[PDB]
Amino acid sequence: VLSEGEWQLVLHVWAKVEADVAGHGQDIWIRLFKSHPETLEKFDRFKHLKTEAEMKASEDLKKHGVTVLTALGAILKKKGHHEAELKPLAQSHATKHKIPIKYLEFISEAIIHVLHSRHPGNFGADAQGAMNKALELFRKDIAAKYKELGYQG
Ligand code: HEM
């Protein structure tokens, strides 16, 4: 359980991210694919991209980034009361896409790296600690759902 003070730090920096959802989406997925190439293999729709240049020019990848950040933003705004939002996400990622928990850890790392680079003034040590706590809560609850659904993860 996070304290109200910790949620405030998380939503304060997220408000800045919302000023340019598409741009943040691009930086995050590009950071992930470059740092962990194996994650790209899970997208039959993007597995052909060979360079950072091709990724940055992809309109479809940009669109998907917006979809992903909008879904994550809705969860964070619930401040822990996200049971209803997690069910459909857990089902599709465990049963259809087959995404291991380890890959959710990799994208959490990419999110923190991008926020640190673009928002240093609003992402100091205390704020980073609060964001890590929020993302750990997310992964913990998704993992529990994965188990109930029959996927090891
Ligand atoms: C930050 C956590 C993530 C969020 C909030 C998220 C959200 C979503 C959403 C909303 C969709 C579309 C609806 C659906 O199929 O459920 C989606 C699709 C998908 N996600 Fe995720 N996702 C996350 C992490 C990942 C990761 C780490 C991978 C793989 C490395 C992944 C792979 C996929 C794939 C393959 C699809 C289908 C794309 C397509 O072919 O159109 N997701 N995700």
Side-chain angles (χ1 to χ4, degrees):
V1 180
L2 279 74
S3 62
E4 175 63 21
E6 297 176 316
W7 281 119
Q8 291 302 300
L9 295 175
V10 169
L11 289 305
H12 178 61
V13 65
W14 196 257
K16 304 303 174 189
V17 173
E18 294 187 322
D20 175 29
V21 55
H24 284 78
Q26 283 182 296
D27 291 350
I28 290 169
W29 284 99
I30 287 179
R31 173 63 186 183
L32 176 67
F33 297 152
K34 281 287 188 173
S35 299
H36 302 284
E38 62 266 44
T39 57
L40 183 53
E41 303 294 59
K42 308 307 296 295
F43 297 81
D44 299 315
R45 182 150 65 107
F46 307 125
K47 65 196 302 179
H48 64 293
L49 299 175
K50 302 178 180 295
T51 65
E52 185 176 311
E54 306 195 321
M55 289 173 195
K56 209 167 185 177
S58 178
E59 183 78 311
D60 266 303
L61 182 59
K62 181 181 185 183
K63 299 180 179 300
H64 190 62
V66 170
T67 299
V68 174
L69 289 188
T70 297
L72 180 62
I75 290 171
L76 295 174
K77 290 172 178 178
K78 287 296 185 176
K79 296 184 180 180
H81 301 277
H82 55 225
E83 301 67 57
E85 288 68 32
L86 292 191
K87 291 197 296 186
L89 189 59
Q91 181 174 47
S92 73
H93 286 62
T95 314
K96 184 180 181 181
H97 315 310
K98 300 188 177 302
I99 309 303
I101 296 300
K102 186 178 185 181
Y103 285 14
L104 295 177
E105 287 179 50
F106 294 160
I107 198 170
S108 290
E109 169 188 59
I111 288 173
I112 286 171
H113 174 284
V114 172
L115 298 188
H116 179 261
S117 301
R118 294 180 64 150
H119 307 287
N122 288 305
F123 206 64
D126 291 328
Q128 188 174 322
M131 181 63 81
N132 178 59
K133 207 175 190 296
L135 292 178
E136 295 194 317
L137 178 64
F138 167 69
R139 297 200 304 277
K140 180 175 179 295
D141 287 347
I142 282 290
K145 223 65 192 60
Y146 264 27
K147 188 176 184 299
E148 289 171 46
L149 294 170
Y151 177 60
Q152 178 180 53

